[PDB]
From TrEMBL:
Keywords from the UniProt entry: Chromophore, DNA damage, DNA repair, DNA-binding, FAD, Flavoprotein, Lyase
Cofactor(s) this protein cannot do without: FAD; coenzyme F420-(gamma-Glu)n
Similarity comment: family membership: Belongs to the DNA photolyase class-2 family.
GO biological process: photoreactive repair; UV protection
EC number: 4.1.99.3
Entry protein name: Deoxyribodipyrimidine photo-lyase
Enzyme kind, highest EC tier: lyase
UniProt cross-references to NCBIfam families, sorted A to Z: phr2
Domain Photolyase/cryptochrome alpha/beta: residue ranges: 22-152
DNA sequence: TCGGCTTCGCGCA
DNA sequence: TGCGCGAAGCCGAT
């Protein structure tokens, strides 16, 4: 459908029909940004061909009640900035509240929409809304992958066992799908308050806030400023200051050597394709570039592949057969310690290192990448059953991580607990053949005491 | 029917 | 710290 700098493989049709004479509506869910957004560019290209304006619709659901204020304020503040950025391009944004299956369908009929476009997400709840919208609309419905450099349905048609099988498939498609973004052209034709939604949401989540002994909040909101503009600043500082020594110090939690882009990446406030574009052009350590590109291209987009082809990505069934047989055999093994969800959540275990990892999660909303493996693996070792460990790790990850409720989180937890995208290791009690990590192993790789002292 | 697996632990410079 | 090996199951190039 038209376009020169426009790869049609990024867009697929969800529902055919006659294109109405109304504006093209971009249903924005995952990629909350105005720049480097294929879904917004496709909505603008379609609207240009039909001489109609383009509008953006965001639907606020009740899913914010399952998370904390840290995620709600981070997303809402970025949406207010996004509202001004879209208005400067004469693109109006409508914020609806309620069920997307009921509000999007009612919006299309009331606004006399002609074409519906949405971004892609492999999560289960996103597909449920899409099937409901299809049953309530009669206009064409398109889906755009604006989150991955290579479209998730294009990179692989099946669940990928390991990276070394998915790695050649991704890099072989990079010369085609890695490209600069065209500028978002403003509109020619022009035709709820977010401040009120922010206040109403905060008062709803206030009783569930994570508090200290003196009733002081644990979350520190000054570490990550939300927004499309602030995401660009973080990307620039990583390339200039941190990309060089990323390869050597990425597994040292005592050193702030990560990109810190996951909160913006999860909410779509910055495009991973843009970051890869800037990283590829940077003249930095070749080993560091390969290590970072492997994370933001292979492991990030294999997480989408995992969730897209495994609808039970958050369940014990999604684990590989060897891992399920191993974990089932050790269900009766006596655990050295048993902790409940409340004790895990408050950092009340015998391991100071694990407690320090949980403290970083509660206070900053972003636990270090290396400690997230030790954090999740120890949960498996000190829980009743593999089902309980999976439930507890997912519950804490989605509640307190700014990047939680993400395909990376479910793939990351499945890797740590079920060995997904991993292999078998030495046989052990309780954990079976799943990859093992120990406190002593952390002591030889980084200064464990410094990490503990930083977070009590 | 082999070769190599993200990110492992461990012994040894 | 940095390096080589161990312990393990399996995909995929043939
Ligand atoms: C148990 C566990 C839970 C995790 N929880 C989440 C989560 O809720 N949300 C989330 O986005 N990621 C999660 N991660 C994946 C990864 O640890 C994070 O992307 C990373 O810690 C975020 O910090 P960073 O962007 O500064 O890291 P960087 O080293 O700068 O990573 C760069 C980018 O690459 C991607 N990436 C890096 N590591 C991984 C990985 N192991 N798997 C997939 N993609 C990766 C992310 O998009 C990340 O922003 C989790 C991993 C594990 C093992």
């Amino acid at each position: 459908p038209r376009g020169s700098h426009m790869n049609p493989k990024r867009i697929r049709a969800l529902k055919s029909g006659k294109q109405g004479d109304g504006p093209v509506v971009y249903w924005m869910s995952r990629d909350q940004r105005a720049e480097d957004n294929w879904a917004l560019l496709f909505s603008r290209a379609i609207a240009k061909e039909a001489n109609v304006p383009v509008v953006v619709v965001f639907c606020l659901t009740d899913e914010f009640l399952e998370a904390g204020i840290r995620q709600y304020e981070f997303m809402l503040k970025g949406l207010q900035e996004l509202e001004v950025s879209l208005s400067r391009k004469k693109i109006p944004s409508f914020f609806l509240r309620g069920d997307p299956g009921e509000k999007i369908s009612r919006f299309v009929k009331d606004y006399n929409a002609g074409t519906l476009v949405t971004d892609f997400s492999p999560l289960r709840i996103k597909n449920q809304w899409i099937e409901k919208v299809i049953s309530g609309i009669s206009i064409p419905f398109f889906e755009v992958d604006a989150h991955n450099v290579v479209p998730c349905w294009e990179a692989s048609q099946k669940h990928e066992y390991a990276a070394h099988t998915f790695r050649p498939k991704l890099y072989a498609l990079l010369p085609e799908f890695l490209e600069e973004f065209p500028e978002l052209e403003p509109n020619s034709v022009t035709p709820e308050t977010l401040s009120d939604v922010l206040e109403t949401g905060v008062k709803a989540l206030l009783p569930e806030r994570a508090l200290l002994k003196n009733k002081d909040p644990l979350f520190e909101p000054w570490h990550f400023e939300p927004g499309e503009k602030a995401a660009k600043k973080v990307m620039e500082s990583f390339i200039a200051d941190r990309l060089d020594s990323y390869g050597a110090l990425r597994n040292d939690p005592t050193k702030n050597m990560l990109s810190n882009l996951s909160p913006y990446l999860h909410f779509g406030q910055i495009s991973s394709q843009r970051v890869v574009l800037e990283v590829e052009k940077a003249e930095s350590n070749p080993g560091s570039k390969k290590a970072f590109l492997d994370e933001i291209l292979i492991w990030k987009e294999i997480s989408d592949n995992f969730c897209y082809y495994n609808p039970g990505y958050d369940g014990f069934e999604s684990f590989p057969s060897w891992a399920k047989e191993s974990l089932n055999a050790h269900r009766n093994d006596v655990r050295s310690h048993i902790y409940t969800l409340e004790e895990f959540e408050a950092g009340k275990t015998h391991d100071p290192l694990w407690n320090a990892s949980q403290m970083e999660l509660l206070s900053t909303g972003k636990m270090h990448g290396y400690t997230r493996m030790y954090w999740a693996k120890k949960i498996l070792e000190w829980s009743e059953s593999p089902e309980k460990a999976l439930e507890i790790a997912i519950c804490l990850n989605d509640r307190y991580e700014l990047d939680g409720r993400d395909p990376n989180g479910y793939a990351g937890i499945a890797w740590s607990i079920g060995g997904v995208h991993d292999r078998a290791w030495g046989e052990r009690e309780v954990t079976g053949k799943i990859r093992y990590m120990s406190y002593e192993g952390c002591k030889r790789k980084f200064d464990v005491k410094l990490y503990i002292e930083k977070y009590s």
